[PDB]
Design a protein around this ligand. Structure first.
Ligand SMILES: O=C(c1ccccc1)c1ccc(O)cc1O
Ligand SMILES: O=C(c1ccccc1)c1ccc(O)cc1O
Ligand SMILES: [Mg+2]
Lengths: 230, 229
């Protein structure tokens, strides 16, 4: 690819972290533009997306400073479509595996996350609801993993999709962040340290060791400081 | 492609209708198996449906081969057909256009899909449904389909919008008689003229016609669903 790529996200957004992982995995030449979550979003940002939706990608157009988005560039939103987008722009990076079947399983794995775990990370960590279903969806996602490696063997958009969220969960859990009760937090730290969740615990360590994740995570400290401002 | 394709669905499933539309658009040679029989756990141990078996020997659908690949999750099944039949251009060619087709599905999934269910199956307040319908409508071009030519966007959303119109026209659903009145008038009003044509253009699409039973069959099916009363 020769078109310019710019990724817009609010700071340490896991949805934007998805697209960040994929651009790193893709070897892409891209600009990164973060926006301070707690500020209002600059006036210029409506030229990226009139509704203030984030994350977003601009693609093509002249090279421009991100805070001066060109009207010429194509603007794109929806984090999982942005992952698929990077894969299409950089087919040579094999962000998905090659065969249709393996690609279907990578996407299925994301769907397991979306349909079962994604909502319970917000019920349990932001709405303080009973944690049982969270742990059960975590088990459900865990069961779709192969015994080693990543969701379809080699790293894929599945990981781009799920890594930002699983990585924050452990970080939050280790830190006791969340709206859950002290009882449910003990109960979640205990489940995650048990053999029941060894596979998922291994899946997260291996995610965090991936270079594309490390670069786009920044370190646990900053994400912790970020988390404690929500 | 030469591998065998078998699509498993329940008879009037919109999720299976998704995969059915896409296989028709693709020109695929495939078996269709509508239905839960004991044998189905060989397709998918969790009884998940729709499902596709892919490859292996030719077999009758109720005797799935241990060799065939089993795949589930309707939207991965859509993308799957597209990956197997790139020549059918089930998505457009450029990355930007493919991203907008996928963004359009996300608009349906994230804003309208759940509200369709609150209004028509949980008899919940209808206001939010109409706003998401407008929101999906706003992501359409003034003519044509979601990204111009027919795409997985249509395979993905057609089964649900086509069922919405049919239920509303039929007064099926758990909404109040008042909220049903409010929606029939809204869908016939200028506010929702673009989306009503969308459904019309969809319903004329050959792949839809074939994978739609006919309004008759879908109605007979619809009137045997409890959550519509
Ligand atoms: O199937 C899904 C999906 C399912 C449920 C919720 C959200 C997404 C899917 C997810 C990622 C992707 O790249 C392609 C896909 O089809
Ligand atoms: O982006 C999405 C998506 C987003 C939210 C919910 C469900 C899906 C998407 C939808 C279809 C698809 O084939 C690939 C995709 O990434
Ligand atoms: Mg809940």
């Amino acid at each position: 690819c020769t078109e310019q790529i710019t990724l817009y996200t609010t700071t340490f957004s896991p949805y934007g972290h998805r697209a960040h992982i994929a651009l790193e995995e893709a070897g892409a030449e891209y600009t990164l533009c973060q926006i301070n979550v707690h500020r209002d979003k600059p006036e210029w940002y409506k030229r990226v997306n009139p509704l203030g939706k984030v994350p977003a990608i601009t693609f093509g157009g002249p090279q421009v400073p991100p805070d001066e988005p060109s009207p010429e560039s194509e603007k794109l939103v929806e984090s999982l479509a942005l992952l698929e987008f990077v894969a299409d722009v950089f087919p040579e990076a094999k962000l998905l595996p090659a065969s249709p079947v393996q690609r279907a399983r990578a996407r299925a794995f994301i769907a397991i996350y979306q349909n079962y775990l994604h909502d319970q990370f917000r019920d349990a960590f932001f709405r303080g609801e009973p944690v049982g279903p969270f742990l059960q969806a975590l088990e459900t996602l865990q069961s779709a993993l192969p015994p080693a490696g990543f969701a379809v063997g080699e790293w894929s958009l599945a990981e781009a999709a799920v890594a930002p969220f699983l990585a924050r969960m452990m970080l939050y859990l280790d830190a006791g962040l969340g709206k859950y009760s002290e009882a449910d937090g003990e109960t979640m730290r205990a489940a995650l340290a048990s053999e029941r969740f060894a596979r998922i615990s291994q899946y997260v360590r291996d995610i965090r060791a991936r270079a594309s994740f490390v670069k786009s995570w920044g370190g646990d400290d900053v994400q912790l400081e970020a988390a404690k401002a929500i």
